[PDB]
Design a binder for this molecule. Structure first.
Ligand SMILES: CC(=O)N[C@@H]1O[C@H](CO)[C@@H](O)[C@H](O[C@@H]2O[C@H](CO)[C@@H](O[C@@H]3O[C@H](CO)[C@@H](O)[C@H](O)[C@H]3O)[C@H](O)[C@H]2O)[C@H]1O
Lengths: 237, 237
């Protein structure tokens, strides 16, 4: 184990909490702030807690990253995450971007896990439908993305922690869920995935991906409701 | 050349015109019927024509396939297609499904070209943004999909014909647009892409892919409007 965070405390030497207004990316409904990121207890477990909350028409949630603090290359990254029910507009993600100063998507993006996509709600398997993706290109106008989407066998929103893994070498990005291979992206001649990448976790609320960008269609998070995303640990082997 | 249709006439030994109610697939707004498929002339060019039109709240368009009539395996297929401006909910596609009686998606699906996606309008490059994809898996519950999307250099909705190509061997599916390689899907160990596939062309109107499933939001086909998708030719080499 080269690195492990058990989230006994919020380590500011590793993580930064983000602050953005609604609409900052992907027509998202939440404001990100420091107050909706905490470390706490879930039973016997030390966990990072991202809390989505709604008061009136105002929506808050949490997002952290290890940019300029913790980045790695050609190593295995795993995180144990307990996801909320996403149906009706929640958008949790475990992902990485290039640890350099290049504007997105030139920095590179690996989406290890996201749930909450529009089509999953329409098909009635929002609890099983996972997206994994890579984004790259020298600019936004030249943005390129590869996706794989599938239902896993059983609910990942089942009140349990699940293991999300990326295996990374010169040739391949291999995503696994509870130690079962989900998909492999070929990067052997992709120039954007051979540098240091930092880690992100967030719980977005609505946005293009969920197909919900009007608070009137946000059934997934109600007035007075708080909803948590729990990360028990993250490690780099 | 194994096969070439110049569309001097509609050959019922190769092609079948499809009839479906609105919302048959993907929450699409259009009815498909035989009256909205024709063969005719675009100047000197003999063309297959798929016509989308709106009479009040009734939307009609055209869809054809060569199931049980014309299918192939490990051949290059190209088509020369002129597209309408898709912005505001039009959804043209050139694609393939396995020539067997397995229920979708166990038949396999190759989407060589589709345009008109939500994100294309949101990225203000609706004339340039193309999706390519493969769908497979034993049931609708176990639906798996790989997709690539990017903007091509030049408008594909510019009043001219463009060439859409699939190269297909036992290892690779390679989509090209105007002889520029767009994406390669690895099918080397994917069991769903090693039998005969038939061809489809269609012009859907609205649907989940467009993010417009409500006729009130459909700005791309107004009341009293008529739009044409033109295929000059298709060939298998
Ligand atoms: C690339 C992309 O985003 N979408 C795919 O492209 C094509 C062309 O744009 C879409 O039309 C596909 O939609 C899927 O097509 C299947 C075959 O037409 C549909 O399957 C059919 O479903 C009906 C109703 O349930 C059944 O009665 C038919 O037997 C079955 O073939 C499927 O529902 C639809 O999602 C995209 O895959």
């Amino acid at each position: 184990i080269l690195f492990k965070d058990d989230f006994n405390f919020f380590d500011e030497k590793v993580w930064t909490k983000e602050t953005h207004e609604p609409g900052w990316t992907n027509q998202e409904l939440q404001a990100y702030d420091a107050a909706h990121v905490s470390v706490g207890k879930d039973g016997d477990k030390s966990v990072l807690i991202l809390t989505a909350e709604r008061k009136g028409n105002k929506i808050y949630s949490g997002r952290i990253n290890s940019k300029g603090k913790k980045s790695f290359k050609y190593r295995k990254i795993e995180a144990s995450i307990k996801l909320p029910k996403t149906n009706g507009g929640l958008w949790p993600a475990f992902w990485m971007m290039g640890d350099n100063d290049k504007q997105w998507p030139a920095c590179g993006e690996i989406d290890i896990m996201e749930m909450g996509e529009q089509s999953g709600m329409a098909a009635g398997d929002s609890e099983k439908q996972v997206n994994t993706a890579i984004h790259y290109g020298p600019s936004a106008a030249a943005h390129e993305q590869q996706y794989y989407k599938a239902n896993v066998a059983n609910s990942l929103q089942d009140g349990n922690y699940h293991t999300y893994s990326l295996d990374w070498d010169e040739n391949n990005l291999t995503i696994s869920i509870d130690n079962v291979k989900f998909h492999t992206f070929d990067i052997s001649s992709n120039t954007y995935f051979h540098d240091n990448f930092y880690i992100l976790f967030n719980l977005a609320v609505g946005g293009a991906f969920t197909g919900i960008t009007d608070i009137n269609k946000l059934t997934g998070l109600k007035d007075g409701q708080k909803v948590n995303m729990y990360i028990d640990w993250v490690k780099i082997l």
